[PDB]
Amino acid sequence: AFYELEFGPRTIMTLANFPDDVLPLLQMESLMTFEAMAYLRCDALVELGCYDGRALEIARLLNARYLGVDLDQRAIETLRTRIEREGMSDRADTVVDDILNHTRRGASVGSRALYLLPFNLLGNFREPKRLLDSLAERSVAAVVSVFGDSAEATRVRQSYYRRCGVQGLELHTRDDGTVFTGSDGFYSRSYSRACLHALLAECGLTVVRSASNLFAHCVTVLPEG
Amino acid sequence: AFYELEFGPRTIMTLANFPDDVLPLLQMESLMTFEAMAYLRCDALVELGCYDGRALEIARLLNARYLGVDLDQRAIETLRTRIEREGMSDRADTVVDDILNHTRRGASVGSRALYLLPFNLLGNFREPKRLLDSLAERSVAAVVSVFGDSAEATRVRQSYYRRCGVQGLELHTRDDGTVFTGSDGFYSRSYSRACLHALLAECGLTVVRSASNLFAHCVTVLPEGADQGF
Ligand SMILES: Nc1ncnc2c1ncn2[C@@H]1O[C@H](CSCC[C@H](N)C(=O)O)[C@@H](O)[C@H]1O
Ligand SMILES: Nc1ncnc2c1ncn2[C@@H]1O[C@H](CSCC[C@H](N)C(=O)O)[C@@H](O)[C@H]1O
Structure with missing residues (x-):
């Protein structure tokens, strides 16, 4: 709903609106994704909510396939021009579509694809089970990066979302995370290590690696089967 | 000289002042450092120009030692608080000193230390051979990230330095790279693949892996005569 607005994705994904304490989250998920690709021998990377290809360099340096959803x-047009200039036109592609449409009805990318959900993408879903169930039913390994329920995390987010200029930004503290809502249909929540592992367990996704810094949680998961 | 100014490092290293085209450079530099440490069995990471610990997460995920110079x-105070809260007080450490001072007269970190020169740090040295010569003693390996001489790179750099707000920003075109100067005492040059490999060869640093995207070049080097054991 929110990301169907003209400058909805831009305002959220532009580095100009990023506090300095966001970078640790982005670095942790990048290294987790990179290593998960290598160990699980994933010849493809499917970044859900790629924007301008935030995980293209991972797929590039592993000589793997890439798909940015x-x-x-405008952001996908930057990624198309980037793929051409880098010379990955043969092993890189982009689609302008809802990530749920791709995960449900889309075609396979390579033989073994890793599905990245970067920069608290899972937090922007009210019913995230629908997305995680489509991954589980796809029988593909995945990486899930979310914000933490620490005091520092919530502070960085509050600053981060205010720079983006989310109309009617309201903080809602819960036991298993902190939820930020906006008048422009903006929804975003953080996760506790326990809640995230519990949610993934409910959707039949086994955790193999689990990294957690001050600001973020990142987990590599495998579908049961 | 420029980075001894109160808000010299702040303006250059604040994410808000970064174009979106810069993140690929940082990502490539991170992945190569992460993999170099693993392959070369480095038990310690020494990030020169760490700011707020920009490579701390690499040392964290490898269970390796860390030293931010x-x-x-203010940036080292953020890193100290972060090291304390993430429970790395025994593994991680920080110093507020000139990197050349540390590299010449500083104590070693662990048995096998990899020295990271991130985000075109080497470019901000008029006489970079001074910095490269000092690495031989205290390190078994090093990662050198640096902007490219490409038209797209110079465009992103001009955009990047303008957002940082460098006083009297001037572009000086060369065959080797592109030099950006400021009236603050700011200096920052890019390198060509050839000129970088040539400079590292002169200082006795052998290139092992060499990655290059549209904007940047990143190389893993070994000092000639250093230990290559486990
Ligand atoms: N349903 C959907 N289909 C496609 N892209 C989506 C999407 N939902 C989100 N995205 C994309 O996901 C990217 C990152 S979402 C970033 C979330 C934010 N950091 C937070 O804390 O909540 C954006 O570029 C956005 O356009
Ligand atoms: N001589 C020195 N001693 C200590 N830190 C230094 C230093 N020279 C630079 N730094 C630090 O190095 C960090 C990165 S410098 C980044 C260079 C910039 N991206 C460019 O393109 O030119 C800064 O935080 C700065 O404080």
Whole structure:
């Protein structure tokens, strides 16, 4: 709903609106994704909500296939021009579509694809089970990066979302995370290590690696079967 | 000189001042450092120009030692608080000193230390051979990240330095790279694949892996005569 707005994806994904304490989250998920690709021998990387290809360099340096899924057409156009200039036109592609449409009805990318859900993508879903169930039913390994329920995490997010200029930004503290809502249909929540592992268990996704810094949690998961 | 100014490191290293085209450079530099440490069995990471510990997460995920060197007091204070809260007080450490001072007269970190020169740090040295010569003693390996001489790179750099707000920003075109100067005492040059490999060869640093995207070049080097054991 929110990311169907003209400058909805831009305002959220532009580095200009990023506090300095966001970078640790982005670095942790990058290294987790990179190593998960190598160990599980994933010849493809499917970044759900790629924007301008935030995980293209991972797929590039492993000489793996890439697919960037996002609703922002302007950001996907940057990624298309980037793929051409880098010379990955043969082993890189982009689609302008809802990530749930791709995961449900889309075609396979390579033989073994890793599905990245970067920068608290799972937090922007009210019923995230629908997305995690489509991954589980796809029989593909996945990486899930979310914000933490620490005091420092919530502070960085509050700053981060205010720079983006989310109309009617309201903080809602819960036991298993902190939820930020906006008048423009903006929804985003953080996760506790326990809640995230519990949610993934409910959707039949086994945790093999689990990294957690001050700001973020990142987990590599395998579908049961 | 420029980074001894109170808000010299702050303006250059604040994410808000980064174009979106810069993140690929940082990502490539991170993945190569992460993999170099693993392959070369480095038990310690020494990030020169760490700011707020920009490579701390690499040392964290490898269970390796960490030392952040930077002139910014406020940025090192953020790193100390982060090291404390993430429970790395026994593994991680920080110093507020000139990287050349540390590299010449500083104590070693662990048995096998990899020295990271991140985000075109080597570019901000008029006489970079001074910095490269000092690495031989205290390190078994090093990662050198640096901007490219490409048209797209110079465009991103011009955009990047303008957002940082460098006083009297001037572009000086060369065959080797592109030099950006400021009236603050700011200096920052890019390198060509050839000129970088040539400079590292002159200082006795052998290139092992060499990655290059549209904007940047990143190389893993070994000092000639250093230990290559486990
Ligand atoms: N249903 C959907 N289909 C496609 N892209 C989506 C999407 N939902 C989100 N995205 C994309 O996901 C990317 C990152 S979402 C970032 C979330 C934010 N950091 C937070 O804390 O909540 C954006 O570029 C956005 O366009
Ligand atoms: N001589 C020195 N001693 C200590 N830190 C230094 C230093 N020179 C630079 N630094 C630190 O190195 C960090 C990165 S410098 C980044 C260079 C910039 N990206 C460019 O393109 O030119 C800064 O935080 C700065 O404080």
